Design an enzyme around this catalytic site. Structure first.
Site, PDB file in Angstrom:
ATOM      1  N   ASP A   1      -8.402  -2.709  -6.534  1.00  0.00           N
ATOM      2  CA  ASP A   1      -8.297  -3.929  -5.614  1.00  0.00           C
ATOM      3  C   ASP A   1      -9.067  -3.422  -4.293  1.00  0.00           C
ATOM      4  O   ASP A   1      -8.933  -4.082  -3.461  1.00  0.00           O
ATOM      5  CB  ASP A   1      -6.951  -4.080  -5.300  1.00  0.00           C
TER       6      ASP A   1
ATOM      7  N   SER B   1       0.721  -1.213  -0.082  1.00  0.00           N
ATOM      8  CA  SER B   1      -0.052  -0.031  -0.001  1.00  0.00           C
ATOM      9  C   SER B   1       0.859   1.277   0.103  1.00  0.00           C
ATOM     10  O   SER B   1       2.000   1.385  -0.780  1.00  0.00           O
ATOM     11  CB  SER B   1      -0.837  -0.200   1.236  1.00  0.00           C
TER      12      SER B   1
ATOM     13  N   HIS C   1      -6.740  -5.441  -2.000  1.00  0.00           N
ATOM     14  CA  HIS C   1      -6.038  -4.669  -0.961  1.00  0.00           C
ATOM     15  C   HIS C   1      -5.468  -5.470   0.327  1.00  0.00           C
ATOM     16  O   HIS C   1      -4.334  -5.500   0.760  1.00  0.00           O
ATOM     17  CB  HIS C   1      -6.299  -3.373  -0.564  1.00  0.00           C
TER      18      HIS C   1
ATOM     19  N   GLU D   1      -6.438  -8.913   1.295  1.00  0.00           N
ATOM     20  CA  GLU D   1      -6.269 -10.330   1.028  1.00  0.00           C
ATOM     21  C   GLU D   1      -4.794 -10.334   0.847  1.00  0.00           C
ATOM     22  O   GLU D   1      -4.012 -11.390   1.375  1.00  0.00           O
ATOM     23  CB  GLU D   1      -7.074 -10.797  -0.210  1.00  0.00           C
TER      24      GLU D   1
ATOM     25  N   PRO E   1      -9.442 -13.077   4.396  1.00  0.00           N
ATOM     26  CA  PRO E   1      -9.300 -14.296   3.763  1.00  0.00           C
ATOM     27  C   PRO E   1      -9.183 -14.582   2.243  1.00  0.00           C
ATOM     28  O   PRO E   1     -10.135 -13.696   1.703  1.00  0.00           O
ATOM     29  CB  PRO E   1      -9.920 -15.449   4.607  1.00  0.00           C
TER      30      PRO E   1
END
Ligand SMILES: [Ca+2]
Ligand SMILES: [Cl-]
Ligand SMILES: [Zn+2]
Length: 387
Positions: A316, A112, A357, A359, A365
């Site tokens: 995402d 990120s 983003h 996961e 999960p």
């Protein structure tokens, strides 16, 4: 690929993130899937984890990362501090790798906004800051070695789902309330409530420079309301600013690729194109918060004044996919599709993965994503880099 270097890996979080002792041990790097740092260490790749201000500017975060690495008291620069109105010095760290001052190096795996921070730390090590150097001289005050320039200790940088060109999420209505709801969603993922006045810190935003901290008897709900109205959210010296398309461009103007560092970028996408007007929608499995609150907007927002169009719709859940392969807006950095060999001084586009983003770091999960294999492969690639 044969290991070509012995540099340890350093993990660096984004707009949310905390240390291994925080969140009651729930790891940002691994989340519900496990402990990534541990997986790498157990596999022969020495790995450490950095914890910097999640909402702070990349500049503040780079100064914090620097001190955390070589050891010492965080120094944001006398000029920077005077200009933005916060303390020049932050907390003091013992130093994870003091050998960096004697020739040792590291690789940085950043997620990120952490990718912006990693790039900036490299830029500052290499060139320092002219404004800081001048200010120190004119005011007869000390200068952090970080701002001198002529330094280097990062062999490679791998970014994952990084908003190198920013994310349009920041242009959303009530982005302020929804951004802090994101923080609350992450707290819930870690099984932490936002309406409880925890006596232990739990999640330290590291706002020492701003003189901010959750108070005794204060819940995160109440604390976040204070943060929304504080300088770490309302000033230009914030993650919020650097996260925008505008801010990421200004950052790209001076944070350039160093010819002495290999850069690898991984992109993420978790949406499908509809059949109405070509907008993108969240795929099944996307973390609930993003699917409901963020994906819809990211997949349909367009702004003429900012140049935001159809290439930006794929995302995402937090960041526009096109923004992840490397900096482009206001950047002269070169981005090249991974051809089998990693190259220095340029961005090696390692491709796009069908993971969202959260996961990608295990916070949400995704059984179909072999997260353990993913990070071991990334570690092996960095270890293969010729020094
Ligand atoms: Ca999922
Ligand atoms: Cl306070
Ligand atoms: Zn600052």
């Amino acid at each position: 690929s044969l290991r070509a270097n012995d540099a340890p890996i350093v993990l660096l979080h984004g707009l949310t993130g905390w240390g291994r002792e925080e969140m009651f041990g729930f790891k940002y790097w691994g989340g519900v899937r496990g402990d990534i740092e541990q997986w790498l260490n157990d596999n022969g790749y020495r790995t450490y984890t950095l914890a910097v201000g999640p909402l702070s500017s990349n500049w503040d975060r780079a100064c914090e990362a620097y001190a955390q690495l070589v050891g010492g008291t965080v120094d944001y620069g006398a000029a920077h501090a005077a200009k933005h109105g916060h303390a020049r010095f932050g907390r003091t760290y013992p130093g994870l790798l003091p050998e960096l001052k004697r020739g040792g190096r590291i690789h940085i795996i950043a997620h990120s906004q952490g990718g912006q921070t990693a790039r900036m730390l490299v830029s500052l090590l290499e060139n320092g800051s002219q404004e800081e150097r001048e200010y120190a001289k004119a005011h007869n005050v000390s200068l952090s070695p970080l701002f001198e320039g002529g330094h280097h200790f990062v062999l490679s940088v791998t970014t994952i789902a990084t908003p190198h060109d920013g994310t349009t999420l920041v242009n959303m209505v009530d982005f302020t309330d929804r951004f802090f709801d994101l923080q609350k969603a992450v707290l819930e993922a870690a099984a932490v409530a936002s309406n409880v006045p925890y006596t232990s810190q739990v999640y330290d935003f590291k706002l020492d420079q701003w003189g901010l901290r959750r108070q005794p008897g204060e819940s995160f709900d109440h604390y976040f309301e204070r943060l929304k109205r504080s300088p770490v959210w309302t000033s230009t010296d914030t993650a919020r600013y650097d996260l925008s398309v505008s801010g990421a461009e200004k950052l790209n103007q001076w944070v350039q690729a160093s010819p002495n560092t290999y850069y690898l970028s991984f992109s993420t996408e978790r949406t499908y194109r509809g059949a109405l007007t070509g907008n993108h929608y969240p795929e099944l499995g996307m973390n609930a918060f993003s699917a409901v609150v963020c994906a819809p907007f990211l997949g349909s927002y367009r702004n003429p004044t900012l140049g935001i169009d159809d290439r930006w719709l794929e995302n995402d859940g937090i960041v526009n996919t096109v923004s992840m392969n490397g900096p482009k807006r206001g950047s002269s950095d070169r981005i090249v599709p991974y051809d089998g060999t990693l190259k220095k001084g340029v961005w090696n586009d390692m491709g796009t993965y069908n993971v969202d983003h959260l996961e990608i770091i295990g916070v949400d999960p995704n059984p179909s994503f072999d997260i353990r294999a993913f990070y071991l492969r990334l570690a092996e690639q960095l270890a293969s880099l010729q020094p």
